Amino acid sequence: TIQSSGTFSSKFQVDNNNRLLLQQVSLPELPGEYSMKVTGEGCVYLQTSLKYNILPEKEEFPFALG
Amino acid sequence: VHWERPQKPKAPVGHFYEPQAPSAEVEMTSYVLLAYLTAQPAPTSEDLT
Amino acid sequence: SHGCFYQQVKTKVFQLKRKEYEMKLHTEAQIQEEGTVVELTGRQSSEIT
Amino acid sequence: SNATTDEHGLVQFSINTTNVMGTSLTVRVNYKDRSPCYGYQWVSEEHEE
Amino acid sequence: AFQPFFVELTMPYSVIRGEAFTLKATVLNYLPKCIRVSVQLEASPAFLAVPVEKEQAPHCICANGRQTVSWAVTPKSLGNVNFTVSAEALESQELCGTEVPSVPEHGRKDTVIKPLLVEPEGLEKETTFNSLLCPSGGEVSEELSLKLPPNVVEESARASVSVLGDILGSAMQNTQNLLQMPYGCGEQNMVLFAPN
Amino acid sequence: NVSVCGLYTYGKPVPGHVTVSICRKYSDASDCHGEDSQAFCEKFSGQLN
Ligand SMILES: *[C@@H]1O[C@H](CO)[C@@H](O[C@@H]2O[C@H](CO)[C@@H](O)[C@H](O)[C@H]2NC(C)=O)[C@H](O)[C@H]1NC(C)=O
Ligand SMILES: *[C@@H]1O[C@H](CO)[C@@H](O)[C@H](O)[C@H]1NC(C)=O
Ligand SMILES: *[C@@H]1O[C@H](CO)[C@@H](O)[C@H](O)[C@H]1NC(C)=O
Ligand SMILES: *[C@@H]1O[C@H](CO)[C@@H](O)[C@H](O)[C@H]1NC(C)=O
C-alpha cells in the first residue's frame, strides 16, 4: 500500500501466480511524501523513477572580452 | 551498480581476446553480492538493496 | 612555355590497403609541332608498406 | 628504460654489463603488437620493432 | 480513398514547448479545371502561429497541380494539441487560367483536424530510487521523500513506482539453455562440469 | 537497368527528386575502426517528373 499525504492512496497485491508480474503506477504530486506499507509474507522489489526538466539559468553578464 | 577492473588497465594492454586478463567482472561482482548476502543471524535490508 | 607542370592528386581512388599492389607512374609528354610522344616509367616501387 | 628522439632521432643508450651469457635488446615506440585491428586476415598495417 | 481536392499537412510526431518550428501545409488538385485556393488554419490559444507567405494570394493549381505554404508556430500547452486546417475553392477569378467553375460537393471545403504531441521544454533528466521490502510473516514500512524542484518547470515532474519479484526476468533462458555433455581434459572437464 | 517509381495516395504519381545509390559492398578496406566497409557506390540524381 502506497499512502501519500495529499489523499493519494494506492494498493497492490502480489501472489505466486503474478509472481513475476510488474505492477507499475504513476505518481502525480510534485511534492513527494510517499509512505510504503507492506504486509504478509514474501519479498517485493520496489523501483521508483522520477523525471523532470531543467536548465532555465546560466545566462549571466561577465567580462568575457566581448 | 557494479565494479570493473581499474577502469582500463594502466600499463600497455589489450589488442583483444582478453589476453592474460579474462575481465572477471561478472565473477567479482557476484563475489561482492555473495559477500553482502552473508551474515550470521540473517542479512539486513541495505545489503539486500 | 616557361617552367614545368605540377599536379596534386588524391590517393582515395587507390585504396592503399591489403589487396591493391604497387604504384607505376607512366608519364607521357607530347611535344608540339611534331606530334612526338615519349613515355617514362617511374616510381613503380613506391613502398606502400 | 625510456628515452626520446632528438633533432636527429638518435639515442645513445648505455647499459652496464655484469650479467648472463647472452643479452637480448629491443626498442619500441608503440607496444609489441599492431595495436589497431591486427587480427582479421584482411589487414594491412605494421610497426617495426 | 481519395478526394478530388485535398489539403495535407506535414510536421513531426513530437515537438518542444520552447523552441519554434514550421508546419508545412500542402494542397493537391486532381480535377482538370484549374482553380485558385484559399488555404488557412484555425489555431487555438494553446500555441502561436505566424504565416510566411500570407500576403501573396495563391494563383491556381490545375490537374495534378499542388501548392504549399508554411507557418512558423511555437507551442504553449503540453501533450496532444489539435490543429485545424481549412482549404476551399473560389469562383470568378479568371486571372490564372481560362476558366474556374469551382463547384465541389456540399463538403467543398476540406476541414482537417490533426493532433500533434509536445513535450515539456528544458533538458529532460531523471532520478531513481529503489528498495527491497521483505515482510517475513509480519509488517514492514518505508518512507520515500521525492523533492527536487531546483530551477525546474511546473508539470514536468512525473514519478512512478513499480512493484515486482525479479529473480525470473532471466531465470528462463540460461537454466534451460545450459546442461551439456562432459568431455575433454581436466580443465575442460571442469569447465563443462561445474556449471551444471 | 535501373528504375525508380514512387507510389502515393491511391498510387498516383508524385513529383520530386530522387537519389539512387547503387552499390557494391565489402571492399578491400580492412573494415575496422578506420576503414569503411562500404565498397564502390554510384549516386545518380533524377528529377521525378
Ligand atoms: C481535440 O483532440 C481530441 C483527441 O485528442 C478530440 O477528442 C475526441 O473528441 C470526440 C468528439 O468530438 C470524442 O468522441 C472522442 O472520444 C475524442 N477522442 C477520443 C480518441 O476519444 C477533440 O475532438 C479535438 N477537439 C477538441 C475541441 O478538443
Ligand atoms: C619513462 O621514464 C622517464 C624518466 O626517465 C619518465 O619521465 C617518463 O614519463 C617515462 N615514460 C612514460 C611513458 O611516462
Ligand atoms: C654499472 O652498474 C653496475 C650495477 O651493479 C655497477 O656495479 C657498476 O659499478 C656500474 N658501473 C659504472 C657506473 O661505471
Ligand atoms: C534496359 O533498358 C533498355 C532501354 O533503356 C531496353 O532496351 C532493355 O530491353 C532493358 N533491359 C535489359 C537491357 O535487360
Swiss-Prot record, chain A:
Subcellular localization(s) per the UniProt record: Secreted
Coiled coil: none
Tissue/organ expression: Secreted in plasma.
Complex and partners: Homotetramer; disulfide-linked.
Function: Is able to inhibit all four classes of proteinases by a unique 'trapping' mechanism. This protein has a peptide stretch, called the 'bait region' which contains specific cleavage sites for different proteinases. When a proteinase cleaves the bait region, a conformational change is induced in the protein which traps the proteinase. The entrapped enzyme remains active against low molecular weight substrates (activity against high molecular weight substrates is greatly reduced).
Family: Belongs to the protease inhibitor I39 (alpha-2-macroglobulin) family.
Name of the protein in its database record: Alpha-2-macroglobulin
From Swiss-Prot, chain E:
Isoglutamyl cysteine thioester (Cys-Gln) cross-link, renumbered residues: C185-Q188
Tissue and organ distribution: Secreted in plasma.
Subcellular location: Secreted
Protein origin, superkingdom: Eukaryota
Disulfide bonds: C34-C62, C60-C96
Residues bearing glycans: N82
Record function comment: Is able to inhibit all four classes of proteinases by a unique 'trapping' mechanism. This protein has a peptide stretch, called the 'bait region' which contains specific cleavage sites for different proteinases. When a proteinase cleaves the bait region, a conformational change is induced in the protein which traps the proteinase. The entrapped enzyme remains active against low molecular weight substrates (activity against high molecular weight substrates is greatly reduced).
Description of how the protein assembles with itself and partners: Homotetramer; disulfide-linked.
Homology family: Belongs to the protease inhibitor I39 (alpha-2-macroglobulin) family.
Name of the protein this chain belongs to: Alpha-2-macroglobulin
Organism: Homo sapiens (Human)
Portion of the full sequence shown: 788 to 983 of 1474
